[PDB]
Amino acid sequence: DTRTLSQQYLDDVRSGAIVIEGDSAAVSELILKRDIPIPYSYIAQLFATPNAFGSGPACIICHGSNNPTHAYRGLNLSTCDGLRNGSTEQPARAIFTPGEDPKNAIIGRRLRANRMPLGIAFNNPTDSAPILAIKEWILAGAPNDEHFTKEILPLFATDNTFGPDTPHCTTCHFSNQEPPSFHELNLTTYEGIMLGADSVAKGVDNATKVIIPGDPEASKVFQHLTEDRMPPGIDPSEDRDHPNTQILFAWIKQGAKCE
Template identity: 50%
Template sequence: MFKAKNVIRIGKGANAVLARPLSGIPLAIWAFSLTFALALGSTAAQQTPPPNPHSPPPTSVTHQMYLDMKLGTLNIHGDNAVVEALVLQRDIPITYDYVATLMRTPNAFGEGPACIVCHSSNDQLKSYRGLNLSSCEGILLGATEAPANPIVIKGEPFQSHLIQRIRNNRMPLGTPFFAPVDTDSILAVKDWINAGALNDENFTTKVLPLFVDPVAFGSETACTECHKSFRDPPSFNEVNLTSYDAIMTGAFSKTRKKQNLPGLPIVVPSNAEASPLYQRLTTSRMPPGTDPGSPADHPNTLLLMRWIEQGASCD
């Protein structure tokens, strides 16, 4: 086993694995996980007989991992494989200790400073938004500067503002971090939503044309360049901003329709702050400096989401 340019190689020949350690996971633990898994499952890629229905159940998660690899049902490959295969798929409890490590680790969710550099106190004179990410209590309390709001909704990672800020890029892509959020165009969208998001003359003449204007929201790309149909591709997240009905249909409508579910709303009438459409026009991805082209689902982000999904326990 050796390390070069933050990449480790474990095993020999065709069975070797190249992997890059994750932020917040010590190299020794990372390497041990892969070495142990490979040692147990060196024949995982080969055809093996189905499990014996009369075999005793696994006695531990380690035993289960061994059985899965022996049967070829656990495949470990790629940078994020260990987290996905050994943690997320097995619903291993995520402790607050690990979450605390993430908040203190630079580049934990993408290139940028540690979260607690900017958010370490509920005092709004010392910490942006009066947000304290240096303790579990602070995370659950949320932002204290007006408008005060929680950043974690237990059991609902996608509804939690903390996850939204880590995953979601400001729109349109390429908008500078310090671009104003109170321009006439943005306020027009905000006022339309807060007035009930009606399909009226104001929407038709003042709001809808903004989505086809390449300079309306601080970039040089019209919203409809990336959001013009219910298919992905060509429209990211199956968002369609070409008409009132399309906007109100929401995101992932085509995919969710197959599951007899409505699209995810991007507009919450009378509540711009809760509307993803307005949020994406005004909030930049955290931490500052994260490349908008970097993957939204960094392994550490997935672990943070799982912690919230499991109830955001402080234990």
């Protein structure tokens, strides 16, 4: 306001306006809430340092060029224009959009979204028959037909469908009750699937839909089935809301500026 950070701070401690709820309160209340500008120099350091978002190798080792024989997906995370360009190998695509919330863009999911069924190792195929079966079903408008009930619905209910020694989805997702069904997602019936997640904990018409008929690419189910969290092999129990993840998101929302 022409007001200094210090002044807003001193006013905020009087007010009681700052609330400390968790280990990441410094980041949450003083950095994100105050919209402090994030320098690209810090962002560069995140992609270059190991364990920057949770245990594993530095992103730039495997994604350090727009050459597809030196870097996976022709994705260059080591430069500001590279980040903005995204994957250059066909099918080429951006991994976020400057100025927009990246939480559910490709970069957001790769940092925060555990592959399903939870715990499955990255060396299991993401193009397997069951996955492609679901992809096609979603494409066909995700109908509730004979075919679905017979050939698709049991994929969520059978052990070892997407890899050896893996539990059926409905082990963890079988009701809309807060525990024991995670995210209150119920994958036992057609209706449970199209209802989506968190319908009890949030609005029933603010429920997180997991199937988007006509669109496999935007379907949380298909995304979770096909996207390995980064860096590859990162354990599921690693914090999905790492402060560096949040500082990264802030930088993107601020324009992904090379300044």
